[PDB]
Amino acid sequence: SKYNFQTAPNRLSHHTYKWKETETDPQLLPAWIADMDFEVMPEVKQAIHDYAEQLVYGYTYASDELLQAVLDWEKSEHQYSFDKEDIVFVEGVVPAISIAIQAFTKEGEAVLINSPVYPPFARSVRLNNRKLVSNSLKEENGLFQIDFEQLENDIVENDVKLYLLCNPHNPGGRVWEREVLEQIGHLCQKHHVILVSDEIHQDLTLFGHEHVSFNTVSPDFKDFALVLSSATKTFNIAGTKNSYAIIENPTLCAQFKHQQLVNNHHEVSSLGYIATETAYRYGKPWLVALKAVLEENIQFAVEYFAQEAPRLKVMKPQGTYLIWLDFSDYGLTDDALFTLLHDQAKVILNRGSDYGSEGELHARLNIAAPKSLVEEICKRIVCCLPK
Amino acid sequence: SKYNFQTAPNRLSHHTYKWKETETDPQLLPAWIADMDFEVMPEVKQAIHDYAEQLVYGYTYASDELLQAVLDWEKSEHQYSFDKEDIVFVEGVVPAISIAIQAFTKEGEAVLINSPVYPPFARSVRLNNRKLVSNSLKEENGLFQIDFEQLENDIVENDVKLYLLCNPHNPGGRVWEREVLEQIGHLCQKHHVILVSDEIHQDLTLFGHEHVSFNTVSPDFKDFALVLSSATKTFNIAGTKNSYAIIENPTLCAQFKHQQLVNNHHEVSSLGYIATETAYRYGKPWLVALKAVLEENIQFAVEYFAQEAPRLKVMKPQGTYLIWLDFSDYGLTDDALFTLLHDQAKVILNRGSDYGSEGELHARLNIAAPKSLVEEICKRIVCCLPK
Ligand SMILES: Cc1ncc(COP(=O)(O)O)c(CN[C@@H](CO)C(=O)O)c1O
Ligand SMILES: Cc1ncc(COP(=O)(O)O)c(CN[C@@H](CO)C(=O)O)c1O
Ligand code: NA
Ligand code: NA
């Protein structure tokens, strides 16, 4: 218990998204947006104090030490070896997604996602005036799976140019096996599709599930695929605004960097650089401790819901700290479910329908909070469900 | 008991752009990129420490207190009154310029600048595949002036859609009079041109020169013009990454915000928000003290160069902390001037030619450093100039 996973810091004065509603209605307990109600690792807090003590807060660049820290993290944690020149810093992963869409496709061309998925995927495609192709995931034995026949159909019928892959997949928390990723890659090679693998949850695979970074699947995958990740989801530092793309293919790397500069989206803040380097240098023990806490919270929620709401269908995450809940067996509409949870149960969960039509009558639950808070949130979710 | 403008914090370990070359060649003295070698106001330092003590560094948004701080600053310092909903935060001004180009013009359409000017102006136009129209500034009696006859010709002959205005103008530090701004505005009305006024140096007008913010010139100007500014240049906090657009016209504001979201360039870091609010709420006395130091440094440089290098033509800034130096009386090429300053004099100044063809044989000198450092830099500049 060296690190504090037992007590949530009070965030009410910090202008957070997560606790905003609670500031007006103190009864509301938020468990929606993916940041954590855990204190950040102490080395990052110290690094922010140390930044203050620089005294001058001018223009800074991404250092060789930061580049090496990213290289070292990827090698040590994900067995992914590349060169410092392959790293492109971006203030966030969602920014990187828009840059990729703009760099690798033209207006009107088709971009494929596996639905239901993180809403900025569909939004970034549509707002960019690209054609969205939603490849609907199957649900079998409590897990999402890809229908590869329909995936190929979706690619061919729509002349898909870009595939935005989520790995681990949010929502659901699906940690794709190497064999699944290999089939995806072969389809991209066949049909000349560029693949962007959003691996922001890569450090949060649980219960023995192992993240397989996309370009580690086959040595040639870097010819068409790039990887996005960050320290921010792993270490709860989203407000520091830094992330990266690993782009080993020279042409793809130049294309991305060019579009990033066209958009004047090439700079990152000083603390963005500092916090990522610090997290990667010092964060491993904290991450190990976090993952044990997350596993306990998830197991608790699954068992509690099984006992108190056996009609509630719970997808057990293989990774991420987010649980996908299916209220389909209840006599509720999508809107009535939202009103029930928010107004009667006083719990704020993400509306599943935000993620696509497959999310109708679902909600997403964030369990990256102390066990006592998770216990209360689960109690509230089961309190008011209709007979 | 008073603010420190006498000693410069050591920056060699902070991965700064400004001191980067000096990290490898200790002989080199930088006076190029516009950040200051002055300690930032103490309250911003404290705000960074306070941010560390939030303990959780998750997702945040722009608070009503920050919005009010910007409103209050704009009203009290620039007599510019508008509503909180007119403010759009962007991680930087150069980001905002690209968003504006993309939002308000189509590919192939013409964008006008007054050359020579801050290089990202020309770059952002060119990289965006817009046609660049450079309206060349006159130089008369040591000051840049607009040729309004040619400006109108440039607008009409090229069907200009967007005018990127720099006010105060960098380089040269020209603080455009109200009457000059009114003539520009009237041309934009006549010819249906949208105008973006980059007023990042607005708080740094000197020697009795007063900034006139563009939309304060006429109540009609908001129909076609928006204002970009920031706390970063004023208060030496560029690394914190926040700035704003004031867009009073509903259509222009929606267009800008839409494009910002298309580009996923809508979020700002938590410290970005914090540092700007803090600077505006506590910064005025520091700024008053700064301006006295800057005037002293500029006066020193002008007089020193007048004695030690009478052939060197020095444009005295009306604002900004940057001096535009003209070496055209010397038997030098643009390349030879750069080599002389950098390799013999051991000083790093911005290359004038970066700013446009009018900057050939020029260099830009940054005097926002302690007087003792400025004295040394000036001594170096005059040491090795050829007969
Ligand atoms: C697949 C994926 N890609 C990107 C991000 C966020 O990226 P950014 O913070 O780097 O922009 C998230 C976090 N998503 C959070 C925050 O919105 C959530 O509530 O789901 C994500 O799940
Ligand atoms: C007219 C103008 N607009 C914008 C900026 C910087 O804007 P940003 O840092 O907010 O993107 C500057 C600072 N310019 C610095 C940093 O490059 C200089 O050395 O000139 C500027 O002079
Ligand atoms: Na659908
Ligand atoms: Na020119």
Ligand nearest to the CA of B198: 2
DSSP of B183-197: HHHHHHHHHT-EEEE
| CA distances in angstroms from B60 to A12, A237, B386, listed in the order given | 11, 11, 56
Q: Resolution in A for the shown PDB structure?
A: 1.7
Pocket lined around ligand 2, Cβ cut-off 6 Å: B 33-34, 92-94, 118, 166, 170, 198, 200, 230, 232-233, 238, 243
What phi, psi does B116 have (nearest 5°)? -80, 150
Set of chain B residues whose Cβ sits within 8 Å of the Cβ of A261: 127
Contacts across the A-B interface (CB distance below 8 Å): 207
The rounded distance, in Å, linking the Cα atoms of A195 and A245 is: 12
B98 close to A (CB below 8 A)? yes
Beta bridge partners of B88: B245
Ligand nearest to the CA of A137: 3
- The residue count of chain B comes to 387
Instruction: Yes or no: say if A321 and A367 are a contact pair by the CB < 8 Å rule.
Output: yes
Q: Identify the CA nearest to B289 among candidates B368, B171, B198, B365.
A: B368
Domains of chain A: 1-57+283-384 (3.90.1150.10), 58-282 (3.40.640.10)
Give the neighbor-by-neighbor strand order of the sheet with B350-351.
B313-315, B322-326, B362-366, B350-351
What does DSSP assign to residue A284? H
Task: Report which secondary-structure segment, H or E, holds A138.
Answer: strand A138-140
Interface of A with B in 202-241 (CB under 8 A): 236-241
Interface of B with A in 54-83 (CB under 8 A): 54-63
CA torsion angle for A202, A208, A212, A216 (degrees, to 10)? 120
Contact B239 A37 (CB under 8 A): no
In three-state secondary structure terms, B167 is coil
Tracing tokens 């770059």 back to the chain, one arrives at B123
Give the neighbor-by-neighbor strand order of the sheet with B110-115.
B87-90, B243-246, B225-229, B194-198, B160-166, B110-115, B131-136
What phi, psi does B325 have (nearest 5°)? -105, 135
- Rounded to 10 deg, the angle between the B250-262 and A120-127 helix axes is 120
Interface of A with B in 27-46 (CB under 8 A): 33, 35-40, 44-46
Contact A35 B58 (CB under 8 A): yes
The alpha carbon of residue B235 and the mean position of all alpha carbons in its chain are separated, in whole angstroms, by 12
**CB of A118 sitting under 6 A from ligand 1:** yes
Q: Which residues, 6+ apart, have CB-to-CB distance to A71 below 8 Å?
A: A82, A83, A84, A87
The rounded distance, in Å, linking the Cα atoms of B72 and B90 is: 19
- CA angle in degrees (0–180, nearest 5) for B243-B247-B248: 140
Distance A164 CA to ligand 1 centre (A): 14
For B96, which residue in chain A has the nearest alpha carbon? A264
Set of chain B residues whose Cβ sits within 8 Å of the Cβ of A97: 264
- CA angle in degrees (0–180, nearest 5) for B11-B232-B267: 110
In three-state secondary structure terms, A18 is coil
| CA distances in angstroms from B359 to A66, A275, B328, B354, B364, listed in the order given | 36, 39, 10, 7, 9
- The one-letter code for the residue type at B269 is S
Beta bridge partners of B164: B113, B196
Tell me: is residue B170 an annotated ligand-binding position: yes
What phi, psi does B129 have (nearest 5°)? 55, 40
- The one-letter code for the residue type at A39 is E
The rounded distance, in Å, linking the Cα atoms of A371 and A304 is: 13
- The residue count of chain A comes to 387
- Residue-wise over B235-260: b if at least 16 C-beta within 10 A, else e? bbbbbbbbbbbbbbbeebbebbbebb
The rounded distance, in Å, linking the Cα atoms of B310 and B318 is: 21
**For ligand 1, what atom is nearest to the CA of residue A166?**
1
**CB of A238 sitting under 6 A from ligand 1:** yes
Do the bridges between strand B243-246 and strand B225-229 make them parallel or antiparallel, or are there none, so unpaired? Answer: antiparallel
Of the candidates B14, B54, B63, the beta carbon closest to that of A54 is on B14
CA torsion angle for B132, B154, B93, B215 (degrees, to 10)? -160
Instruction: Yes or no: say if A337 and A268 are a contact pair by the CB < 8 Å rule.
Output: no
The rounded distance, in Å, linking the Cα atoms of A326 and A313 is: 5
- CA angle in degrees (0–180, nearest 5) for A305-A308-A309: 65
Residue B50, CB-side half-sphere exposure with 13 Å CA sphere? 13
What does DSSP assign to residue B26? T
Q: Give start and end residues of each alpha helix (H) in chain A.
A: 20-24, 42-52, 64-78, 93-104, 120-127, 148-157, 178-191, 232-235, 250-262, 270-282, 284-308, 334-339, 371-383
The rounded distance, in Å, linking the Cα atoms of A7 and A370 is: 6
Tracing tokens 């790093």 back to the chain, one arrives at B348
Ligand nearest to the CA of A356: 3
Tell me: is residue B175 an annotated ligand-binding position: no
Tell me: is residue A382 an annotated ligand-binding position: no
- CA angle in degrees (0–180, nearest 5) for A273-B271-B206: 105
Tracing tokens 């995450």 back to the chain, one arrives at A317
- The one-letter code for the residue type at A60 is T
* A386 φ/ψ sector (left φ>0, alpha ψ -120 to 50, else beta): beta
Q: Which of A36, A170, A242 to mutate to test the pocket of ligand 1 (most atoms within 8 A of CB)?
A: A170
The rounded distance, in Å, linking the Cα atoms of B221 and B219 is: 6
Instruction: Supply A216's token pair.
Output: 């580690």
Cα Dmax for chain A: 62
The rounded distance, in Å, linking the Cα atoms of B137 and B70 is: 32
**CA-CA-CA-CA torsion sign (A107, A113, A116, A117):** negative
**CA-CA-CA-CA torsion sign (B36, B37, B39, B45):** positive
